[model samples]
Target: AFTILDVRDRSTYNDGHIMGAMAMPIEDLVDRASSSLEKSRDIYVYGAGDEQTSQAVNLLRSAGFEHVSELKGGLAAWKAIGGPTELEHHHHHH
Candidate 1:
């Protein structure tokens, strides 16, 4: 199975993300790459759009992640393709 990583900051993540995506900011991506991921799992890096996605892809590749790939258009594309989005909703329990 592959892992979908969101290379965005906490605020962005709080906004919404692919249903099961793992959040790992681009800044910390390389440092976390080696220990956290497995070669057998396809690492699909993504963010708000091309810029962040491309950056994450390069970071993973430079860090020797063999199966790394970008999610063509990031979260926007995911939503366009009917992929589910997680919206944070909070309420007071009474």
Candidate 2:
């Protein structure tokens, strides 16, 4: 199975993200990944923007990950294609 990595901040990720994606903030990516993920596993990553996504992909590559790819167009593209999503709860104070 492929891993869908979401490198955006927690807030942005909590707002909404591709279903089945895991949150791996850019700041703690290598550390977290090195401990948790397999280097040979296929990974599809996305961030808040194209540049961010690219950066994440490069980071994973440099960290010795072999099967990493950028999820082009990120959440919007996924949504456009009717991919499933998960949204965080918004607590409203009345």
Candidate 3:
């Protein structure tokens, strides 16, 4: 009944994200989401730390995904609440 999008770059997402959350790009959010996500789905979005509060609503509701909500503190808040996070083990390559 609910979907979460970690709207950050892949590397940032690979670092950590809510379990079961989808990794997406704030850059192409509308285009990709419009193509894949149901317009009426419960979509929770967060990313870019600074802009996330403005990012989701500014992008979603108008584009037709009306049920979007922003995760105010994003991963930080999730972590604060001790929510499990999915992560990729990376050494270094970039």
Candidate 4:
């Protein structure tokens, strides 16, 4: 199965994210990428938009991740297409 990587920060992730996506902020991707992801699975990286997502793609490639691809247009595009997002709510808000 392909793995989805969300390269946004924890704050952005808290807002919403694709279900089952792994959060690995772009800043730490190089150091944590391999340990966090499987080499055999296809890696699909995305972020808030082109700036972050594009950088993530390049970083993954440079870090030696094979079979990597990018989610075109990132989260904005995904949301535009009716993709589902998961929220991390700790408690009900009054």
Candidate 5:
């Protein structure tokens, strides 16, 4: 199965993300992916916007990752296409 990477801050990622997507914030992407994935693994990356997504894809490619692709429109497009999502809980204690 292809890996879906959310290249956003942890708080943003925790707020909501593509179902089954892994959080790999931009700052930590290369290091994290290097340790966790094979260079040839299929990776679909998204972030705050298209530009960011493209940046992430480029970073992976430059770092020797061969099968990385950008998920255009990021989460909004994913939601538009009815893709499943997982939202973190927001607890309010009175």
Candidate 6:
């Protein structure tokens, strides 16, 4: 399994995020993710810029998570390069 992480200030989460991304602050990222997500799962993460993005990845890695990577250029760039803002199609497959 894999997941997308959006880490930054509240403003980042206040804005529309990448489709299906799990948004949170960097301070809470490690424990929150460890408790909720699989550490072995791939982590596709981003922040407002390279600094925060890289920090997020490294923190996950340092916390013993495998396969964490930075998602450069955050939300704005994701849309600029043609990514969706949201993707809810009455989907809840469990």
TM-score of each: 0.85, 0.93, 0.88, 0.85, 0.92, 0.84
Off by over 4 Å in 4: 90-94
Q: Which tens-of-lDDT digit does each residue in 1-94 have in candidate 4?
A: 7988889997788788888888789988877778877666699989878788889989888778877898998877888999988978655466
Q: Which order, best to worst by lDDT?
A: 2, 5, 3, 4, 1, 6
Q: Report how far residue 88 has shifted in candidate 1, in Å.
A: 4.5
Which is the winner by TM-score between candidate 3 and candidate 4?
3
Q: Write the per-residue lDDT of candidate 2 for residues 3-90, one digit (tens) a residue.
A: 9999999878888999999989999999989999999999999998899999999999999999999989999999999999999876
Q: Can you list the residue pairs that collide in candidate 5?
A: none
Order the candidates by TM-score, highest first: 2, 5, 3, 4, 1, 6
* lDDT score of residue 93 within candidate 3: 66
Stretches of candidate 2 off by over 4 Å are 90-94
lDDT of 5: 0.93
**Clashing residue pairs found in predicted model 6:** none
- lDDT of all predictions: 0.83, 0.94, 0.84, 0.84, 0.93, 0.82
lDDT of 5 by residue, 1-94 (tens): 7999999998898889999999999999999999999999999999998888888999999999999998888999999999999988766465
- Over 55-82, each residue of candidate 1 has an lDDT whose tens digit, in order, gives 8888888777888988988888898989
| Least accurate 10 contiguous residues by lDDT in model 4 | 85-94
Q: Which number leads on TM-score?
A: 2
- How many steric clashes does model 5 contain? 0
Regions of candidate 5 where Cα sits further than 4 Å from its true position: 89-94
Which of the two, 4 or 6, has more lDDT?
4
**Candidate 3's error at 30, in angstroms?**
0.8
